[PDB]
Design a protein around this ligand. Structure first.
Ligand SMILES: Cc1cc2nc3c(=O)[nH]c(=O)nc-3n(C[C@H](O)[C@H](O)[C@H](O)COP(=O)(O)OP(=O)(O)OC[C@H]3O[C@@H](n4cnc5c(N)ncnc54)[C@H](O)[C@@H]3O)c2cc1C
Length: 246
């Protein structure tokens, strides 16, 4: 991996709750940046007084003929670092970054049906995966979003059906309700990314309840309600140190 610098070249509001930024990056190995579902760590704050603060966002795409990546930010009413950074972020804003990180991709091997679950934070990862989709594999995709028509941005591919549910603010387990209700349960493979607690629920269902092999349930928690990314990191470090001990 590398530590680059990104400079914002474009800013869009594709949906009312999403800010789409494009930036050139000074990569010296663009071969790394072409894989699907790459994520970066943006140094959202770097005061000279104090340790730096980073946050993880998905590379929606990487254009190699101009070294431009794009990132979708889910707006959320929180005085968080990434939110404070996005409020004052103009074209030409330079921001530090570390990456890329390859992240989960569906298991196309053996030709099993793919079933995908996502909330607003994993819609960019979904777009990345769909733009390099293994033609011939079928899928059911369930999206949990605040935007009524979040699927419109994703491509139309033969045999990928994309289902979107609509959340209303300040209130449920929708993605799980979809997992409990699939047409069949045999010869399928799972990919998911959402809030930490809903993702754990999905993992528990496809493993401890439907006996799916562990490499056929690729599930991640992109964020956790009431816990900051920084706190998630300190937790992940302590689990790792405790995992290697046994
Ligand atoms: C691999 C990976 C890829 C990711 N890609 C994206 C992406 O492409 N786009 C994107 O918008 N996010 C993405 N995320 C999630 C993002 O990193 C977190 O949402 C992050 O916590 C937000 O930064 P912050 O400074 O707002 O939040 P923090 O300071 O971490 O959060 C503090 C508070 O905000 C809450 N919070 C954080 N995010 C949300 C949210 N989306 N909705 C509601 N409440 C929230 C937390 O629960 C916490 O209570 C990704 C995460 C991972 C692991």
């Amino acid at each position: 991996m590398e530590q680059l610098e990104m400079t914002i070249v474009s800013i869009q509001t594709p949906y009312p709750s999403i800010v789409r930024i494009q930036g050139k990056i000074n990569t010296l190995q663009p071969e790394l940046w072409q894989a699907p579902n790459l994520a970066i760590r943006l140094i959202v704050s770097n005061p000279p007084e104090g340790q730096p603060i980073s946050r993880v966002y998905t590379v929606r795409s990487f254009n190699p003929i101009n070294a431009q990546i794009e990132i979708d930010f889910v707006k959320h009413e929180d005085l968080s670092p990434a939110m404070e950074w996005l409020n004052s972020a103009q074209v030409g804003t330079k921001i530090g970054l570390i990456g890329p990180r390859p992240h989960f991709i569906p298991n196309f091997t053996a030709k099993k049906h793919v079933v995908m679950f996502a909330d607003d934070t994993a819609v960019p990862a979904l777009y990345s995966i769909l733009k390099q989709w293994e033609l011939g594999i079928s899928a059911d995709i369930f999206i949990e979003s605040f935007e009524k028509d979040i699927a419109s941005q994703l491509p139309e591919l033969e045999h990928v059906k994309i289902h979107s549910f609509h959340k209303e603010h300040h209130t449920k387990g929708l993605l799980l309700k979809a997992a409990f209700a699939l047409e069949h349960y045999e010869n399928i493979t799972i990919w998911a990314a959402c809030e930490r607690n809903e993702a754990r629920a999905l993992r528990q269902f496809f493993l401890e309840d439907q006996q799916l092999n562990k490499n056929d349930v690729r599930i991640a928690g992109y964020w956790r309600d009431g816990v900051s990314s920084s706190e998630l990191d300190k937790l992940r470090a302590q689990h790792y140190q405790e995992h290697i001990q046994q």
